[PDB]
Point group: D2
């Protein structure tokens, strides 16, 4: 009795916003991945922060290895309603991942937390960490990992594990070439999610042992979790027990955005008729730096004609004139002149599309300025020559790609 | 030299948000007029507050006679980003109008301001008051009134004046039946705007003289301004000298929203191709309770068909499905199911329109829930019976009106 | 499991900050009692708000029936850390005590809380309401009252009750002339504390029944609690189960400041060697509007001599020169010139004491300006003539008394 | 007319809070110099920020070039009250001196500011920059430098200049070995203050051109100001025209805190009877992150004896018992047990002094824990052996020094 409320108070979160995502070729060149925009007005890291608040954890330690400017500006601007007088703060702790928490160890000790929540903030999900902690304490563990079945065809990109009846870790392997399958199913492999919970005093004792190691890669998956697994102190936490989902019949939603295609497919999943991820949830609202923007102004074309939309999102500040829109997502302050045709696109902020454009299966970067008459996504080899094109068919367009093409982005 | 900066630092604004917007019949029944929504995401009072900030005046005294909760929430949330050890504050001073500033006289003195800016916050405009204070000091005046020519056909609703070559007040009359016309034009009458500037020590001396008067109506226009005009200490300030207009060639924008038709016509003026009021202007921005809303989600109808829009605004949180929209303004969190036809409407927040509705020249009040099949604006006598209809043709729709009609509005 | 964390989120607090504080004769005439300053920089209402935060309840509804100006200022400055996404917000709901709640019923329905916490914010205490909600739900109750034993000699000022073995309410009487004593002790009477917890749907159903009552006093103690007691649905919650106290051996701290002597005695209780109330708690802190003040500047007198202090408090901004201080509490921006002798005093903010004063058992009101040579607390009849003096011996000094006396306070 | 109001709105500040602080050898090893505490609760950088607000510049760009966490935490907590819609914010732009402002050129342009104010935020002063901008535009300069006469015995640590009758720069030299004296006085040298004002367009071209130089040190003083001086476009701005000072007869206050002695002597200047720097100025106040702390609690010693103070400061949260204090400055949450004797010290926050200590001419670092019986400042050779001792006589004590001495600071 009186445990669920108490446990978040004694813990602190360590978002590992390292922004690698090397598959996002040029999208993360000038910004860490956690600060990638997603679903209108949000960043990715808000999904990690908002799950910390709504789960009760109001002490959060961001660890931006990249030392990025936009992430700092976002945390500073949006997540700046906290006062340390009440023991609620977002701490920016600039610097393998595991070593990165060792340099800021002397600060983390000053929090004097009993437990800690390691998070990878370059993911999209909803989870109630308090429900995870309860499962950590009831088992009397030292390390609680968030496990989730995934297809074996991509299990090589995560850490795979094998558990007993009591969710105790028996075997663990980090990024195997031939992932072991679950015993009751060959087509899937129980995978880690980059969400760990540690009892603090064990971690501090453990990291120093790793800091002195001359061979450790200083990574959680490759160095520490196998060591704890050898020690027999690690336990698992099936993610569906904690996944916040309106429909209990639906599957858990955890989207690794590691590549471009999944970024596009995940942003458009919002625009569909029945989204898998519900932002309208009022019991788990997601927060962000919400700048003041005028309403989404649709207008008539130069010819006085109307504009069509079909299964699309339109943020604040946008401006659209005529210009058939389909299956697309328009971020803030976008401008779309007349006679355009946009189909299954993702337009990041402050874009300015000219007249008579035609876009199909594209991802436009921030503040690009497409010229008049540009056509994208209809001829593969042409688009591959000008811009980057993935094997799936998706196209990416950044300021530099156009800059080299001779168009002007000064505006 | 160094004067324009020093002057706003010695002055404080007094917004008279009494909001006795009687001609707004039922729209202001449950809320003070300043807290009326206008333009998508804005109240009316922000126009008075934002002009005080952008003119440098960061001490503002809101004088909410009505003692509303919504206005106090708006000020508390949206406009309470201040630090008071730096002498910048929005202050709520609850209680004719002259007497409204006399009860809080003891509180006002403590600011120790040399000048004061009287404002009526139930109007819409943009003005740089530092440009007014400069014209106040250069003239060595004690009262500076903001004068603006207006059509004589409606000059009876304002205070009329007659000035000399030096903008000194010669004759003043408050709300005449036969307004005198300007000398150089019969069709117009130089009118007051409800914007006054007083040298502080004079005002305090003057109001006490009025408070002891057993016959004064305790109102600025009917009691004090005639007294100062008799004293020959009042001077005028033509509003074009201070009107912040993006397009210099255009005429100054001052909309008295006193009646319903002007509210509708002013909100739709935004939606036009070339708005008279530019809120996109970044050299004179306007603030508000910028709440967080998911993007404007357009979708397909039940039949999988598309949706059209034409010269319209769409706030955040809205949801539209098919449903042809024209010339309309949709405030936040509005839901519009399929087969609708909306034409020159103004839909305040949280409305829920059912299927197969048809709206024309209407104003929906907050959080109404229209039932399925409703038709508005096509038959005058029917709409006059069910709802309130103005002589111009405009229609007003309130929660109570439909409650009386029998459609349950609990949601 | 997992019910403790979700109990606060589903509830909302209703601070009844409308106390007349009639027993405090002139201290609270110009300010509502909750806004009375206490123990340095804090007000009284912060103890109610800070217990709501630290118990998890982040939705708070203030009610300000009488002299609602300073309180609004404080709430809008100190407690304007609004984050409407996650439904954590301090709300201002201006208008017997129940009557005040009913008028704002339609708003309270908009919070969609399962439970509600009624509080009297004109008291001083520390409590963890989540530990009350747990005791409310485990008993399966509908009304949970916070009970505390008190001396029978003053039990007439509170509501007395008599309970069975299971903390169920058997008998209840509001403010009796002859308080019934507890059965196991004649010298005490189990009393209410003005802290109630109601399951929301029961309250809304219940208040309308009371609103239609033509004879009810519209007060919680005299009308509703006897009704629920007759229904046999009220249960008690002994406060020691929830009192936050560093030393478990000490008694619970609940100070009704209802009279002047208790206000003085409570403020000086801080200054003692071992305070009964501990503000130095990292685990359970108390917030307030903390303006940037310079540090407490002690200096030399006109004669170059030193200043002594003994068991005293000194806020920020203060300035003490020489001037022996004892057992006293100095609020912010106090100024104390030389040759003074202060013994067991309570000096509210911005006081300016002149030279060669001598104060003993006094309470100075905000922003008074004592003249040179004034002597207080040494001759009873003289002090009774000039100022207000209580039967215990304490003296109160407001600006008005001095203004009448002839020492101007314009400074 | 209307110029001084309009000028700050078009300008932006660039705080160069990247100082290595080599001269403060141990104080700033773990923190940037701007984050050094000063005068109770303040940080040095607040003097530059508060001068930007109170001079009207509400766009400020901090440049935390290295070893900065504390600074980010201070800005993020205390100084983040972003408007962001009115165009007022505190940016953080992490990275010679000119390289720091070159790398963030892309971000800075985005402001579209006509003028810019280069500042060195590792100084203490009060200045109204709008008076500087007025003096900048009236002269038609492209670079305005803040000039101040200083003693020639230390002019070698600053940039020296020589001007004509119209404050135009004739000769300039950055950190000379033999400083030239002013013509009308040999004992002084007109020196730069690290406060520059540039017309924005000229600055970007100037910086871009500087970037390509393979021999420039990328510093303002050594590279750019000589180049502009050669061009004859640089003008001076005598600091007394802009120095904010209560007493006009006093000298201008600009304290370079470059060494430890000046840090001590400047903090103790506050504690004197008549401070040179006035924090008690309502018309020109200075902000800071002000955590809510309880009042300064003085108490009795173990023997029940009293405590003396003489020309001292005591912040909030402090606790003092007996323990004669003289000429000293006690920062927040200080603890001082009995029988202590403190004379002309500077105790940074969270210090814990044991019993029977004796301190003289010392500077204690944040969060030290002095042991019982320690004596400092009475035997020079002993203190030089244990801690750092300056040539002037001042002593610096930090945690690391104590840690090596065998004491334990784990508390
Ligand atoms: O006669 P006055 O000038 O109104 O003074 C009465 C006193 O009451 C107060 O308004 C009380 O203020 P607060 O309760 O808001 O602290 C003082 O500021 C004021 O000096
Ligand atoms: O880092 P050390 O050697 O443990 O010393 C610790 C102390 O120094 C500090 O880092 C000083 O930091 P600041 O200068 O940022 O206030 C404190 O955070 C801490 O209490």
């Amino acid at each position: 009795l009186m445990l669920a409320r108490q446990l978040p108070l004694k813990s602190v979160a360590l978002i590992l916003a390292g922004g690698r995502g090397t598959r996002l070729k040029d999208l993360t060149n000038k910004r860490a991945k956690p600060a990638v925009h997603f679903g209108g007005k949000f960043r990715i890291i808000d999904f990690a922060l908002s799950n910390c608040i709504n789960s009760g954890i109001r002490r959060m330690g961001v660890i931006t290895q990249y030392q990025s400017h936009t992430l700092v500006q976002h945390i500073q601007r949006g997540w700046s309603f906290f006062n340390e007088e009440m023991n609620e703060f977002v701490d920016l702790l600039p610097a393998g991942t595991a070593d990165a928490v060792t340099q800021n160890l002397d600060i983390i000790r000053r929090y004097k937390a009993e437990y800690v929540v390691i998070l990878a903030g370059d993911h999209i999900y909803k989870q109630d960490y308090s429900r995870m902690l309860i499962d950590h304490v009831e088992k009397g563990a030292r390390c609680t990992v968030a496990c989730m079945p995934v297809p074996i065809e991509e299990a090589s990109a995560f850490g795979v594990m094998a558990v007993d009846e009591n969710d105790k870790i028996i075997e663990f392997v980090e990024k195997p070439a031939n992932p072991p399958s679950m015993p009751n199913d060959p087509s899937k492999s129980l995978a880690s999610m980059g969400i760990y919970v540690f009892d603090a005093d064990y971690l501090y004792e453990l990291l120093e042992e790793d800091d002195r190691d001359e061979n450790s890669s200083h990574d959680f998956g490759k160095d520490l979790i196998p060591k704890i697994t050898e020690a027999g102190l690690a336990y698992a936490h099936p993610f569906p027990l904690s996944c916040v989902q309106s429909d209990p019949d639906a599957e858990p939603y955890w989207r690794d955005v590691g590549t471009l295609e999944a970024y596009w497919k995940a942003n458009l999943d919002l625009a569909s008729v029945v989204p898998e991820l519900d932002m309208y949830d009022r019991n788990w609202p997601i927060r962000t730096y919400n700048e003041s923007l005028p309403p989404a102004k649709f207008v008539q074309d130069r010819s006085g004609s109307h504009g069509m939309t079909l299964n699309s999102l339109v943020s604040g500040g946008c401006v659209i004139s005529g210009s058939v829109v389909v299956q697309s997502v328009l971020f803030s302050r976008v401008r779309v002149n007349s006679f355009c045709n946009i189909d299954s696109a993702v337009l990041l902020p402050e874009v300015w599309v000219g007249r008579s454009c035609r876009l199909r299966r594209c991802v436009i970067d921030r503040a690009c300025v497409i010229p008049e008459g540009m056509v994208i996504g209809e001829n593969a080899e042409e688009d591959a020559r000008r811009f980057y094109r993935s094997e799936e068919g998706i196209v990416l367009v950044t300021r530099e790609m156009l800059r080299k093409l001779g168009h002007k982005q000064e505006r």
